[PDB]
Design a protein around this nucleic acid. Structure first.
Ligand SMILES: [Mg+2]
Ligand SMILES: [Mg+2]
Ligand SMILES: [Mg+2]
Ligand SMILES: [Mg+2]
Ligand SMILES: [Mg+2]
Ligand SMILES: [Mg+2]
Ligand SMILES: [Mg+2]
Ligand SMILES: [Mg+2]
Ligand SMILES: [Mg+2]
Ligand SMILES: [Mg+2]
Ligand SMILES: [Mg+2]
Ligand SMILES: [Mg+2]
Ligand SMILES: [Mg+2]
Ligand SMILES: [Mg+2]
Ligand SMILES: [Mg+2]
Ligand SMILES: [Mg+2]
Ligand SMILES: [Mg+2]
Ligand SMILES: [Mg+2]
Ligand SMILES: [Mg+2]
Ligand SMILES: [Mg+2]
Ligand SMILES: [Mg+2]
Ligand SMILES: [Mg+2]
Ligand SMILES: [Mg+2]
Ligand SMILES: [Mg+2]
Ligand SMILES: [Mg+2]
Ligand SMILES: [Mg+2]
Ligand SMILES: [Mg+2]
Ligand SMILES: [Mg+2]
Ligand SMILES: [Mg+2]
Ligand SMILES: [Mg+2]
Ligand SMILES: [Mg+2]
Ligand SMILES: [Mg+2]
Ligand SMILES: [Mg+2]
Ligand SMILES: [Mg+2]
Ligand SMILES: [Mg+2]
Ligand SMILES: [Mg+2]
Ligand SMILES: [Mg+2]
Ligand SMILES: [Mg+2]
Ligand SMILES: [Mg+2]
Ligand SMILES: [Mg+2]
Ligand SMILES: [Mg+2]
Ligand SMILES: [Mg+2]
Ligand SMILES: [Mg+2]
Ligand SMILES: [Mg+2]
Ligand SMILES: [Mg+2]
Ligand SMILES: [Mg+2]
Ligand SMILES: [Mg+2]
Ligand SMILES: [Mg+2]
Ligand SMILES: [Mg+2]
Ligand SMILES: [Mg+2]
Ligand SMILES: [Mg+2]
Ligand SMILES: [Mg+2]
Ligand SMILES: [Mg+2]
Ligand SMILES: [Mg+2]
Ligand SMILES: [Mg+2]
Ligand SMILES: [Mg+2]
Ligand SMILES: [Mg+2]
Ligand SMILES: [Mg+2]
Ligand SMILES: [Mg+2]
Ligand SMILES: [Mg+2]
Ligand SMILES: [Mg+2]
Ligand SMILES: [Mg+2]
Ligand SMILES: [Mg+2]
Ligand SMILES: [Mg+2]
Ligand SMILES: [Mg+2]
Ligand SMILES: [Mg+2]
Ligand SMILES: [Mg+2]
Ligand SMILES: [Mg+2]
Ligand SMILES: [Mg+2]
Ligand SMILES: [Mg+2]
Ligand SMILES: [Mg+2]
Ligand SMILES: [Mg+2]
Ligand SMILES: [Mg+2]
Ligand SMILES: [Mg+2]
Ligand SMILES: [Mg+2]
Ligand SMILES: [Mg+2]
Ligand SMILES: [Mg+2]
Ligand SMILES: [Mg+2]
Ligand SMILES: [Mg+2]
Ligand SMILES: [Mg+2]
Ligand SMILES: [Mg+2]
Ligand SMILES: [Mg+2]
Ligand SMILES: [Mg+2]
Ligand SMILES: [Mg+2]
Ligand SMILES: [Mg+2]
Ligand SMILES: [Mg+2]
Ligand SMILES: [Mg+2]
Ligand SMILES: [Mg+2]
Ligand SMILES: [Mg+2]
Ligand SMILES: [Mg+2]
Ligand SMILES: [Mg+2]
Ligand SMILES: [Mg+2]
Ligand SMILES: [Mg+2]
Ligand SMILES: [Mg+2]
Ligand SMILES: [Mg+2]
Ligand SMILES: [Mg+2]
Ligand SMILES: [Mg+2]
Ligand SMILES: [Mg+2]
Ligand SMILES: [Mg+2]
Ligand SMILES: [Zn+2]
Lengths: 155, 78, 98, 127, 24, 117, 60
RNA sequence: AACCCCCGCCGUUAGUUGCCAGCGGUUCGGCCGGGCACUCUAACGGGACUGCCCGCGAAAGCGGGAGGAAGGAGGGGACGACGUCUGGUCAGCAUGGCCCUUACGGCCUGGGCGACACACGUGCUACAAUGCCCACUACAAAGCGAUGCCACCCGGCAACGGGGAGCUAAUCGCAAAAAGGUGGGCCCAGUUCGGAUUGGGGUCUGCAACCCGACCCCAUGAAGCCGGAAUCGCUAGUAAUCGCGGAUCA
RNA sequence: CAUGUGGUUUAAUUCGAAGCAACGCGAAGAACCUUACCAGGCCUUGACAUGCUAGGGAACCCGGGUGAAAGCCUGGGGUGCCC
């Protein structure tokens, strides 16, 4: 990215909810270009969301993903010869991409057999503010403050 | 695996054949290790070429389905 | 009734001979199915550019062998005679059928 | 009397016929919701219709060949769009800015030599 | 996988028809 | 049940059950059921002894297996051993019989890597 | 053993197996395009001089 | 840089490819009558020029917007300066010099280049439930093919063999595309994961498959539960993943 | 597990390529052929080009014995174009 700045790739909305967020989230589930399988596993969980709670999977997804949005992180700025781990803002772009990634990463971490059953639970506990995906969030935020001293390097 | 008529150099057979007539000696030098072991070989002793010299490999009734090559190791460390 | 084949490496020679049969066959004979361009074949040859150890960076050429087809309905003696001593391609190949 | 547009994309092309009717969709025989079973991309290709404010007002007999099922799907949106824009230049004024045109130049890349996949080079090693 | 000589996937990879595949 | 001597396929699909037996695989599995009228999906935990004793005398006779098999296999080698054939000598130094690699790999008959240098 | 083997390949007497390809101009053993009977090398050399009819430098 | 090829969009020319798109016939299969609009085929052109609008600028040109299939080099290939490494190759070939010459030349048989106490590189298959098994059904491209590809029928579980039809190939065949979609089995196990190793039997090419082939079936189910320090590819139809083709060649 | 390379071994395990820019590289087909290596048998104006001298014989075609084959030993038929 030494030249321009790179265009944040655009994305066709959901073939269902019409949500771009869901479109992206699917890609994270997607294994080896098999997009079909990914969507399937997602929607299967989507309905499972209601099967458990009288709530629709819509806001369950937003509520969840919004609780896994890390407010601030630690970037290692190697200035002054040494590599200081400075705490600073998370670009709105990152908060999303990271959340979704952690979401699915923590989801795969779950033990249960079927994959869609993991995306469901992880999604629920996430909106509930309790999931293991949230645990990575609570960490990165604390890891940021455990070094608030060097924050005077915030570029 | 060559099923229809198991190969075996004719001159080699021809050689053992005249030996089956009078039941003579067993002295015999070959160079066709591919040649299959025929039941008429039993009791003989064919010196096979491994690539450097003739190895006096006796041939019992046990060794038959194989070839003369499986008894003249080519690698000098076998 | 007249099914002429027209194959040749150079594509340009095939367009001259294509019109060469359209002029004589039509301007002095019955119906003639226009020049139908058949799907061209291709012989690609990937060769190691160097004479020695140097996989990749190799060059590769190809040998476009063309095809063209034209038909006619009536054996007007005017055409069979004219298109028999006036025709003269070069690297083209002319093979006709009934 | 009818409507026609030529859909194209990725070694796959599609003739589209938007014959006026209720909404009977069918392509290469078989039914829309039959040729594209289990495939979620299906409901997408029919989007150009429900977009122009008229789903239940056109039957849809169509053909398509080459490519893969989804590759055929890409051409469908192109055919359906071109079909109605053909016999109605007013949809162009509001369907063009909404992006339903362009054959989508995205196409397979020619595998270069030395590489593995026109880009994917063989693994490096200094040792 | 593509190494199970005694399955559909296997013979496909190897390019051989064999028993576990249609023929005559 | 103790099918084919001590061998004991138990608590799972009858077809895969007999697989665990030393002389049977996915092949003889489908076939052994189609020679005694047994249902493949049925569990070994729940199936009539009339059906069990059926495979009992069936398999124990239909073909050699277990140690009988494990014995003859030993015999083939002892034969190649005492003959002096190439196929035998490879068994001697434990090298691959299929004359495969040797400069590399071939570990599955050489065991763990020796290193040394 | 470069010339005699050239006379040996064009010989094609014994088993049809023992016969083999051999570049017509240079006389190489390996890399024998059957269509020309040539080796990759000369085949490349000739085409560059167009001495091979209709053959052209591919590029797509 | 540009002039060249491919891919994009539109047109002209052409109808043994395709098409009731239109009708008729129909053993209702584009099969025949028939038709070239259209898919396609392969030649020739149109097209994009910071040409238009706004903003900056002395200019070149830059940023943003419009119309457009395609905007500032649209994407990909071809093309790689004077020279450098006294780089590689005299075992492609040519070529100075040196050297051999009943052998450093020649033919053949057999062996070897395929050794194995190890080390490394490039890779293949995996360690599995986004999974594997089976049955069923669906969509490619590019190519190649007359002592060649095999429609199809008989035999064998099978590789494959006997008999046998079309084609110098947009007309016939290689042909099964796979991932997919549908349905059933599997239940977290060193397992229905994984196919290494080995035993027995068997087929095809070739005089000849011991050394040293390939493929088939039964049995044998190894190491391997995601890999130390370290390290590679890729910025989009890319990487990841699935299958197909050809050169070589019995 | 596949293949290439080091090393090692071997009668031989043919040669080259050597950081990047050698190691699925020359090889886009090592079972004999390929083959450049080793053992043995054997040929030695040569399997390939040109030219001269000398003796017999046409070109040709078939077989015999010996042998792993190469090669070596060797019978029969044939009785051709012009001066
Ligand atoms: Mg900058
Ligand atoms: Mg430091
Ligand atoms: Mg982003
Ligand atoms: Mg080629
Ligand atoms: Mg393409
Ligand atoms: Mg390549
Ligand atoms: Mg690809
Ligand atoms: Mg398995
Ligand atoms: Mg049959
Ligand atoms: Mg084998
Ligand atoms: Mg290795
Ligand atoms: Mg020599
Ligand atoms: Mg050959
Ligand atoms: Mg070769
Ligand atoms: Mg310019
Ligand atoms: Mg096009
Ligand atoms: Mg135009
Ligand atoms: Mg045509
Ligand atoms: Mg009738
Ligand atoms: Mg009828
Ligand atoms: Mg009928
Ligand atoms: Mg019908
Ligand atoms: Mg009717
Ligand atoms: Mg039809
Ligand atoms: Mg017709
Ligand atoms: Mg036309
Ligand atoms: Mg076209
Ligand atoms: Mg013009
Ligand atoms: Mg201007
Ligand atoms: Mg304007
Ligand atoms: Mg103005
Ligand atoms: Mg402005
Ligand atoms: Mg102004
Ligand atoms: Mg201004
Ligand atoms: Mg400005
Ligand atoms: Mg000025
Ligand atoms: Mg602009
Ligand atoms: Mg610009
Ligand atoms: Mg601009
Ligand atoms: Mg450009
Ligand atoms: Mg360059
Ligand atoms: Mg280049
Ligand atoms: Mg200079
Ligand atoms: Mg230099
Ligand atoms: Mg130099
Ligand atoms: Mg120099
Ligand atoms: Mg160097
Ligand atoms: Mg020289
Ligand atoms: Mg030269
Ligand atoms: Mg010289
Ligand atoms: Mg001198
Ligand atoms: Mg000399
Ligand atoms: Mg001499
Ligand atoms: Mg001397
Ligand atoms: Mg020599
Ligand atoms: Mg030899
Ligand atoms: Mg190395
Ligand atoms: Mg490595
Ligand atoms: Mg590999
Ligand atoms: Mg599944
Ligand atoms: Mg699957
Ligand atoms: Mg389908
Ligand atoms: Mg057949
Ligand atoms: Mg039938
Ligand atoms: Mg046809
Ligand atoms: Mg025909
Ligand atoms: Mg046809
Ligand atoms: Mg094929
Ligand atoms: Mg093939
Ligand atoms: Mg097909
Ligand atoms: Mg399936
Ligand atoms: Mg069920
Ligand atoms: Mg279990
Ligand atoms: Mg284990
Ligand atoms: Mg299981
Ligand atoms: Mg075996
Ligand atoms: Mg055979
Ligand atoms: Mg054959
Ligand atoms: Mg084979
Ligand atoms: Mg064990
Ligand atoms: Mg992995
Ligand atoms: Mg590093
Ligand atoms: Mg895989
Ligand atoms: Mg993988
Ligand atoms: Mg082949
Ligand atoms: Mg053959
Ligand atoms: Mg030594
Ligand atoms: Mg070696
Ligand atoms: Mg070595
Ligand atoms: Mg050495
Ligand atoms: Mg070397
Ligand atoms: Mg002589
Ligand atoms: Mg002599
Ligand atoms: Mg002479
Ligand atoms: Mg003789
Ligand atoms: Mg002699
Ligand atoms: Mg004589
Ligand atoms: Mg005589
Ligand atoms: Mg006489
Ligand atoms: Zn050459």
């Amino acid at each position: 990215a030494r030249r321009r700045r790179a265009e944040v790739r655009q994305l066709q909305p959901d073939l269902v909810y019409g949500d771009v967020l869901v479109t992206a989230f699917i890609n994270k589930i997607m294994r080896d270009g098999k997009k079909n399988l990914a969507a399937r596993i997602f929607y299967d969980a989507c309905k499972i969301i209601q099967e458990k709670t009288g709530q629709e999977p819509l806001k369950v997804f937003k509520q969840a993903v919004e609780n896994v949005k890390p407010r601030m992180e630690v970037r290692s700025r190697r200035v002054g010869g040494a590599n200081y781990q400075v705490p600073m803002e998370v670009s709105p772009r990152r908060q999303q991409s990271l959340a979704l990634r952690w979401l699915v990463q923590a989801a795969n971490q779950r033990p249960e057999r079927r994959a869609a059953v993991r995306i469901a639970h992880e999604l629920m506990d996430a909106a509930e503010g309790k999931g293991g995906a949230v645990k990575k969030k609570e960490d990165v935020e604390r890891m940021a403050e455990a070094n608030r001293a060097y924050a005077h390097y915030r570029w | 695996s060559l099923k229809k008529g198991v190969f075996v150099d004719d001159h080699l057979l021809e050689k053992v054949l005249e030996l089956n007539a009078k039941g003579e000696k067993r002295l015999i030098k070959t160079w066709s290790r591919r040649s299959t072991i025929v039941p008429e070989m039993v009791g003989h002793t064919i010196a096979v070429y491994n690539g450097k010299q003739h190895v006096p490999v006796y041939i019992t009734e046990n060794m038959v389905g194989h070839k003369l090559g499986e008894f003249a190791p080519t690698r000098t460390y076998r | 009734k007249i099914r002429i084949k027209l194959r040749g490496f150079d594509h340009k020679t095939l367009d001259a001979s294509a019109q060469k049969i359209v002029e004589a066959a039509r301007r002095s004979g019955a119906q003639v199915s226009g020049p139908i361009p058949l799907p061209t074949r291709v012989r690609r040859f990937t060769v190691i550019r160097g004479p020695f150890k140097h996989k990749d960076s190799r060059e590769h050429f190809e040998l476009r062998t063309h095809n063209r087809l034209v038909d006619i309905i009536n054996p007007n003696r005017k055409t069979i005679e004219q298109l028999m001593t006036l025709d003269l391609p070069t690297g083209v190949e002319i093979e006709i059928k009934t | 009397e009818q409507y026609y547009g030529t859909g194209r994309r990725k070694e796959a092309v599609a003739r589209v016929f938007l014959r006026p009717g209720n909404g009977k969709v069918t392509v290469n025989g078989q039914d829309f919701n039959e040729y594209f079973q289990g495939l979620v991309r299906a409901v997408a290709a029919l989007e150009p219709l429900r977009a122009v404010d008229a789903l239940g007002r056109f039957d849809a007999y169509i053909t398509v060949r080459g490519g893969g099922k989804s590759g055929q799907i890409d051409a469908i949106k192109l055919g359906i769009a071109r079909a109605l824009v053909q016999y109605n230049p007013d949809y162009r004024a509001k369907l063009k800015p909404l992006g339903f045109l362009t054959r989508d130049a995205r196409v397979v890349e020619r595998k270069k030599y030395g590489k593995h996949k026109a880009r994917r080079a063989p693994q490096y090693s200094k040792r | 996988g593509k190494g199970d000589r005694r399955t559909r996937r296997g013979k496909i990879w190897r390019g051989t028809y064999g028993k576990y595949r249609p023929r005559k | 049940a103790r099918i084919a001597g001590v061998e004991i396929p138990r608590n799972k699909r009858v077809d895969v059950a007999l697989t665990y037996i030393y002389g049977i695989g996915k092949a003889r599995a489908k076939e052994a059921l189609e020679k005694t009228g047994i249902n493949p999906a049925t569990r070994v935990k729940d199936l009539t002894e009339a059906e069990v004793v059926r495979l009992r005398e069936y398999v124990e006779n239909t073909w050699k297996l277990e140690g009988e098999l494990r014995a003859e296999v030993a015999a083939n080698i002892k034969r190649l051993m005492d003959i002096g054939c190439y196929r035998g000598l490879r068994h001697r130094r434990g090298l691959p019989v299929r004359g495969q690699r040797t400069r590399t790999n071939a570990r599955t008959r050489k065991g763990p890597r020796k290193t040394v240098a | 053993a470069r010339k005699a083997l050239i006379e040996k390949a064009k010989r094609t007497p014994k088993f049809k197996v023992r016969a083999y390809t051999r570049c017509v101009r240079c006389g190489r053993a390996r890399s024998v395009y059957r269509f020309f009977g040539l080796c990759r090398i000369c085949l490349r050399e000739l085409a560059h001089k167009g001495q091979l009819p209709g053959v052209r430098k591919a590029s797509w």
